[PDB]
């Protein structure tokens, strides 16, 4: 079933704007993660390539 996020902010115009409306949210995070860098060093057309 559908479970809407809280909407304490309220609207003067309210007929349910139809039967109903559901609010969903996008959540953005930033984290510092350890990753392995691989260096391919083929001499052809430039050597260093990480």
């Amino acid at each position: 079933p559908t479970s809407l996020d809280v909407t304490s902010m309220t609207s003067w115009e309210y007929n349910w704007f139809g039967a109903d409306v559901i609010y969903i949210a996008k959540y953005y995070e930033v984290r510092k993660e350890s990753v392995d860098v691989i260096s391919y060093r083929h001499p052809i057309t430039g050597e260093i390539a990480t």
């Binding site: 304490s8 309220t10 309210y14 349910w16």
Partner: protein, 52 residues
């Protein structure tokens, strides 16, 4: 014999043991849109809605 209990101290850690909890279901299930932002302590103590 040795009496060296004055060389130490009674230490109470700054840690809190977990407690008990309850469940919130009814407050989520009951309808809150109609009554939200409608009652004022200054305006009065009762509100009314119309029946079909």
């Amino acid at each position: 014999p040795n009496n060296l209990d004055s060389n130490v101290s009674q230490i109470v850690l700054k840690k809190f043991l977990p407690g008990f909890m309850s469940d919130l279901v009814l407050a989520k299930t009951v309808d809150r849109q109609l009554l939200a932002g409608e009652i004022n302590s200054s305006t009065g103590d009762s509100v009314s809605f119309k029946r079909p």
